[PDB]
Design an enzyme around this catalytic site. Structure first.
Site, mmCIF file in Angstrom:
data_model
loop_
_atom_site.group_PDB
_atom_site.id
_atom_site.type_symbol
_atom_site.label_atom_id
_atom_site.label_comp_id
_atom_site.label_asym_id
_atom_site.label_seq_id
_atom_site.Cartn_x
_atom_site.Cartn_y
_atom_site.Cartn_z
ATOM 1 N N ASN A 296 -12.250 2.386 7.224
ATOM 2 C CA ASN A 296 -13.065 1.847 8.258
ATOM 3 C C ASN A 296 -13.004 0.214 7.802
ATOM 4 O O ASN A 296 -12.657 -0.219 6.572
ATOM 5 C CB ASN A 296 -14.224 2.087 8.494
ATOM 6 C CG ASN A 296 -14.880 1.785 9.714
ATOM 7 O OD1 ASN A 296 -14.313 0.722 10.523
ATOM 8 N ND2 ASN A 296 -16.239 2.120 9.983
ATOM 9 N N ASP B 204 -14.477 -3.478 9.428
ATOM 10 C CA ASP B 204 -15.060 -4.579 10.436
ATOM 11 C C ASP B 204 -14.949 -5.918 9.922
ATOM 12 O O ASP B 204 -15.330 -6.211 8.943
ATOM 13 C CB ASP B 204 -16.552 -4.377 10.591
ATOM 14 C CG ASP B 204 -16.775 -2.747 11.367
ATOM 15 O OD1 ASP B 204 -15.689 -2.240 11.596
ATOM 16 O OD2 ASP B 204 -17.856 -2.585 11.527
ATOM 17 N N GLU C 16 0.568 -1.144 -0.058
ATOM 18 C CA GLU C 16 -0.076 -0.057 0.096
ATOM 19 C C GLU C 16 0.823 1.320 0.035
ATOM 20 O O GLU C 16 2.139 1.283 0.735
ATOM 21 C CB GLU C 16 -0.980 -0.024 1.431
ATOM 22 C CG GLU C 16 -1.695 1.142 1.316
ATOM 23 C CD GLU C 16 -2.917 1.126 2.283
ATOM 24 O OE1 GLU C 16 -3.282 0.217 2.947
ATOM 25 O OE2 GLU C 16 -3.310 2.208 2.804
ATOM 26 N N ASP D 151 -7.264 -11.102 5.333
ATOM 27 C CA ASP D 151 -6.417 -11.248 4.142
ATOM 28 C C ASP D 151 -5.626 -12.403 4.566
ATOM 29 O O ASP D 151 -5.172 -12.610 5.655
ATOM 30 C CB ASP D 151 -5.744 -9.972 4.032
ATOM 31 C CG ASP D 151 -6.273 -8.863 3.896
ATOM 32 O OD1 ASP D 151 -6.473 -8.520 2.547
ATOM 33 O OD2 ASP D 151 -7.053 -8.164 4.581
ATOM 34 N N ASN E 216 4.792 -24.789 -0.180
ATOM 35 C CA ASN E 216 6.207 -25.807 -0.045
ATOM 36 C C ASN E 216 7.157 -25.138 -0.910
ATOM 37 O O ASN E 216 6.734 -24.551 -2.279
ATOM 38 C CB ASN E 216 5.862 -27.303 -0.351
ATOM 39 C CG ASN E 216 5.144 -27.875 0.598
ATOM 40 O OD1 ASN E 216 5.669 -27.802 1.866
ATOM 41 N ND2 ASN E 216 3.897 -28.458 0.420
ATOM 42 N N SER F 225 -12.890 -7.972 8.447
ATOM 43 C CA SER F 225 -12.109 -8.405 7.006
ATOM 44 C C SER F 225 -11.206 -9.355 7.554
ATOM 45 O O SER F 225 -10.894 -9.621 8.529
ATOM 46 C CB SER F 225 -11.660 -7.202 6.340
ATOM 47 O OG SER F 225 -10.524 -6.602 6.791
#
Lengths: 72, 72, 72, 72, 72
Positions: free
Chosen positions: A21, A23, A10, A27, A34, A25
């Protein structure tokens, strides 16, 4: 050759008057890799179990993330 | 060759008047790696169990993350 | 070759008038690695168990993170 | 080659008028590594158990982190 | 080659008018490493148990961190 994996980048520049905001989430919730390089060859193994067992039961969760929120 | 894995990069420049909020988010919640380099060859193993067992029971959680929030 | 894994980088420059809030977030909640380099070869192992057992029971948690918040 | 693992980097420059808040967050909650270098070869092992057992019982937690907060 | 693991780096420069607040956060809550270098080869082992058992019981915690806070 070089590798980039699952990387999150980012950048924000000259940004003004900004809300972010978030709530509940997620990732990369489960990540398994491997990797062998330059190797002269029984094998690496990854397992991941998320069992939920619920009996006569309510509102159970098995998860990487769990968010419960109430606003009045 | 070089590797980047699961790296999170953030940059902020000249940012103004900024809010960031976050309830109950997750990143990289479970991460598993095996890696061999330059190797002349029973194998590395990763396991991850998150069992939830709930019986006659309520509001149980088994998780990497769990957030419960109430606002009035 | 060189490796970067699960590294978190943040940079802030000339930032002004900034809020950051974070309730119950998680990063890298469980992380497991095996790594062999230059090796001439029974295998390394990682285990991770998070069991929750609840019986006739309420509001139990088994977690890397657990946050409970009430605001009036 | 050289390695960076699970390192957290933060830099702030010329920052002004800044709030950072953090309730109940976690980073790297469980971290497990095996590593062998230059080795000429029964295997290193890591285990981690977080069992919660709750019976007829309430509001129990087994966790790396636990935050309970009330505000009026 | 050299290694960085689990290192937390922070730098602040010319910072002004700054609040940082933190309730009940955790970093690196449980960390386990095995490492062998240059070695000519029963294997090192790490265990970590955090059992919570609660019976007919209330508000128990077994944890690395536990914070309880009330504000009026």
């Amino acid at each position: 050759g070089n590798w980039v994996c699952a990387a999150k980048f980012e950048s924000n520049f000259n940004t003004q008057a900004t809300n972010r905001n978030t709530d509940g989430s997620t990732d990369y919730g489960i990540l398994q890799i491997n990797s062998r390089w330059w190797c002269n060859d029984p094998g690496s193994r990854n397992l991941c179990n998320i069992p939920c067992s619920a009996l006569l039961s309510s509102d159970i969760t098995a998860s990487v993330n769990c968010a419960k929120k109430i606003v009045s």
